[PDB]
């Protein structure tokens, strides 16, 4: 282990990325990592198996503009998905030709299908090309992050929500410099409010949603585009339908001024409501809140219908309903997995979506609502080469947390294995921000299952949004600790039930999921054989200061206030490193072999989090003693600055895991 300087007046200095001492600190930990990974002889064998299982063709869900359909395609191992078009159900843009692949993050086709606006990481910048001949327009727009490009129905330009060179809502006309873009909204009073936006399917209304923090609540402003004196060239006169942060609202459809909205107002599991803009105080349930299932999303389709995607004990259910009445017309349950990517719009009569699952790589279903609304027909099916899925099975069980609450978890494993404790086990989780963790497809997970005899578990802990807003709130702010408790209880069940045994269990997560993993190792290190935390939040007292971690106080709180500081100090990972051997009746326990993963250019979760936690752990556990009991290594894998890049990382983590758990190859 290398030398790390503890500033007693300890690792505040790592918060500066560019000093020598930090950049040499990196190199030493890079240097140490590779030395460790060199000992994990199964890295290469995993790496090749991942590549062989990922090598299958994948189609994105298609969408229609005018007479044309568009979709992403990948032949198997291309760096980045390629965007294609066709005349019925051709390359349009191939990012593998730029830098040998960054992918497209923005992609947006005009209503007439003439123009394709898209965005690349120039090191997000939006460009536009003509679909007829693939020639570029000159228009270049910078300072975009996650805003889409929303085309007006005149095909003359589009809305987008850039930051300054204080988020703004702007309109760009085709064939102008970005400096001529109309400013539609900003708020210097509330620099932290951020924006999402949308245009109604009929083209009459531009909708602007304002949000405060990552909380699921938003304002709703409506600009009627048909009542502008000289269109958007004026400058705006928003109708402020909702001007507070009390509930969430998302527009699903409108008939003239009569709008249908999804909301969580007085409805933690969500519902569809109806309001007339011309009479704004009268809201009426259209599809009431289910007291059982989360209404996750809704989409108007085939002129007069609706498709509701419900989440019901962490499985999807799709309902077809009448738009005007709200009446149930059909209900299609979905096997364990996830459907999503429903991009069909109100004047589309064929609906497409994607189904993936732990043992199912990707199916694009097509429901023609005109002709055969009953059955899902397969449009595309991906097949994992050399893999027979009927030797495996996934099942769901519910497990009691500390406080009594049920925690649903999925368990993927080989069929008919004896529950004898002898199987290596990987547990994933996230638990935060109302994010739903679905059991989707991962090729590396298959390698683990087949070539390591592994058992995999996905834990739907609190903090997520799986049982609605109550599930969320029961795992945020003062209640964050429950999330960690849920996860620990999940491992305990895997042990007691006899899938695996303490120290034969690995855990992995990213971002908040990184927090999750860091928190749990401190509190219960005797449980785990291996921990892997991908760019987590590890400094809970200071996270808010950097880049855009300020929009997570909604879910975490903040040290600034005292009541909150006291939740935080209790689980903040760097401030909770302790020698588990220095505790009574706990002496053969050490920390699991740990791998902290992070980039150099992640300006979401800044890497200081990861670095400071590494510094601390190596100190308290290893180098702070002369003959530390901590034998298990504590390293970082740092990604200097794409399919193959992403495969390398995972191959490493899995090789490390296999070493850590003494899992042999099969």
């Amino acid at each position: 282990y290398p030398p790390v300087r503890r500033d007693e007046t300890p690792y505040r200095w790592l918060e500066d990325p560019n000093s020598e001492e930090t950049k040499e600190f990196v190199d030493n930990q890079e240097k140490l990592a590779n030395s460790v990974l060199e000992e994990c002889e199964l890295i290469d064998k995993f790496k090749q198996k991942i590549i062989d299982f990922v090598n299958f063709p994948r189609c994105g869900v298609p969408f229609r503009r005018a007479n044309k359909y568009f979709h992403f395609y990948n032949s198997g191992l291309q760096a980045q998905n390629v965007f294609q078009m066709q005349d019925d159900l051709e390359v349009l843009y191939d990012p593998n030709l730029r830098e040998g692949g960054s992918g497209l993050s923005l992609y947006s086709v005009s209503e007439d299908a003439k123009y394709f606006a898209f965005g690349i990481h120039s090191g997000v910048t939006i460009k536009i090309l003509k679909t007829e001949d693939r020639s570029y327009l000159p228009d270049t727009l910078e300072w975009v992050k996650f805003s889409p490009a929303i085309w007006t129905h005149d095909n003359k330009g589009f809305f987008y929500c850039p930051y300054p060179p204080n988020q703004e809502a702007r309109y760009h006309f085709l064939g102008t410099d970005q400096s001529e873009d109309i400013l539609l909204w900003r708020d210097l009073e509330n620099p932290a409010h951020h924006l999402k936006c949308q245009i109604t399917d009929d083209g009459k209304y531009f909708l602007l949603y304002i949000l405060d923090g990552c909380d699921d609540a938003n304002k709703v402003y409506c600009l009627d585009l048909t009542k502008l004196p000289n269109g958007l060239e004026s400058f705006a006169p928003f109708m402020k339908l909702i001007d507070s942060f009390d509930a969430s609202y998302t527009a699903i459809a409108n008939d003239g001024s009569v709008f249908t909205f999804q909301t969580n107002k007085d409805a933690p599991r969500k519902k569809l409501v109806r309001v007339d803009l011309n009479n704004p105080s009268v809201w009426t349930d259209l599809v009431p809140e289910s007291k059982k299932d989360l209404l996750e999303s809704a989409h108007a389709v085939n002129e007069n219908q609706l498709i509701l995607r419900y989440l019901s004990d962490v499985k999807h259910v799709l309902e077809i309903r009448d738009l005007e009445s709200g009446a149930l017309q059909h209900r299609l349950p979905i096997d364990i997995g996830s459907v999503d990517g429903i991009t069909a719009r109100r004047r589309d009569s064929v609906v497409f979506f994607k189904f993936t699952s732990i043992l199912t790589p990707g199916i694009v279903y097509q429901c023609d609502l005109k002709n055969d609304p009953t059955q899902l027909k397969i449009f595309r099916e991906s097949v994992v080469p050399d893999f027979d899925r009927s030797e495996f099975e996934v099942k769901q069980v519910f497990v009691p947390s500390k406080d009594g609450t049920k925690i649903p978890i999925f368990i993927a494993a080989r069929k008919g294995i004896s529950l004898d404790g002898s199987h290596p086990c990987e547990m994933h989780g996230f638990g935060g921000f109302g994010i739903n963790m679905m059991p989707t497809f991962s090729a590396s997970r298959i390698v683990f299952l087949k070539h390591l005899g592994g058992v995999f578990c996905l834990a739907n802990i609190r903090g997520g949004g799986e049982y609605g807003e109550e599930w969320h709130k029961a795992g945020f702010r003062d209640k964050k600790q429950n999330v960690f408790d849920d996860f620990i209880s999940a491992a305990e069940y895997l042990i007691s039930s006899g899938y695996t045994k303490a120290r034969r269990v690995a855990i992995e997560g990213g971002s908040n999921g990184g927090l999750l993993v860091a928190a749990c190792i401190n509190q219960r290190p005797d449980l785990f054989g291996c921990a892997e935390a991908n760019c987590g939040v590890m400094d809970m007292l200071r996270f808010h200061k950097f880049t855009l971690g300020y929009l997570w106080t909604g879910d975490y709180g903040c040290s600034d206030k005292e009541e909150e500081f006291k939740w935080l100090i209790k689980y903040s990972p760097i401030h909770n490193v302790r020698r588990p051997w220095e505790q009574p009746g706990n002496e053969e326990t050490q920390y699991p072999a740990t791998m902290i993963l992070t980039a150099d250019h992640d300006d979401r979760v800044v890497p200081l989090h990861s670095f400071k936690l590494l510094a601390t752990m190596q100190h308290v556990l290893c180098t702070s003693l002369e003959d530390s009991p901590q034998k298990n290594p504590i390293i970082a894998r740092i990604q200097r600055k794409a399919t193959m890049t992403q495969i390398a990382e995972v191959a490493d983590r899995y090789g490390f895991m296999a070493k850590a758990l003494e899992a042999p190859w099969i």
């Binding site: 998905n81 399919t643 495969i647």
Partner: peptide, 6 residues
Amino acid sequence: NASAPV
């Protein structure tokens, strides 16, 4: 738009 489900 992930390139691969790794």
